[PDB]
Symmetry: C3
Subunit: 36 residues, 3 copies
């Protein structure tokens, strides 16, 4: 019920955090390509 949504929401935040890290690593690759 109320905690089932809490569990789903915590899981989604965790997945979004992991995607953000992968996106930051891609941004860093372009910075390395642009300054070298």
């Amino acid at each position: 019920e109320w905690e089932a949504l809490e569990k789903k929401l915590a899981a989604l935040e965790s997945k979004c955090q992991a995607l953000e890290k992968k996106l930051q690593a891609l941004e860093k690759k372009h910075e390395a390509l642009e300054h070298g």
Copy 2:
């Protein structure tokens, strides 16, 4: 109410899944550039 959050949460998961796929395709492009 309770199902309105359920609907919002299902929509967000669907959008995050679609972003993940686009991020995987970008990662694959860098792998292809790095090994060719």
Copy 3:
């Protein structure tokens, strides 16, 4: 309670929107590299 999840969900959507924009800018960089 009910509005605490609403607040968390609105915050997450806002973070996902900002990641989507950064992902679109990365896609645009590859398009510029592929046609120039």
